[PDB]
């Protein structure tokens, strides 16, 4: 349990900075904060591009 606490605080940075979700409940953070996945630069995988 002591070891698992450290990794839970490490993982939170990615879940906040990339996704804007609260890790415990998995729900979105309330403020509509900036998150990396806000970007309009999406490449979306069709069944032709999936596998490349």
């Amino acid at each position: 349990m002591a070891d698992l606490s450290g990794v839970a605080l490490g993982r939170a940075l990615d879940l906040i900075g990339i996704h804007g979700i609260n890790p415990l409940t998995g729900a979105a953070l309330a403020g509509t904060p900036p998150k990396i996945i806000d970007t309009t630069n999406v490449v979306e995988l069709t069944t032709e591009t999936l596998g490349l």
Binding site: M1, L4, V7, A8
Partner: protein
């Protein structure tokens, strides 16, 4: 008639050793190391979910 070895009915020579097809060995004995165990059921602790 001519005498032939046919009339003697001679026994065959036994040749030493046995010819055998090989047997496939245990994979689990090579992929998993044996742990020392005392006689009976063992119990192992697992982490079910992290905090």
């Amino acid at each position: 008639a001519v005498l032939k070895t046919s009339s003697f009915q001679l026994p065959r020579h036994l040749v030493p050793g046995v010819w055998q097809k090989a047997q496939g060995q245990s994979v689990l004995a090579r992929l998993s190391n044996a742990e020392p165990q005392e006689f009976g059921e063992q119990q192992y602790m697992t982490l079910t979910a992290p905090p």
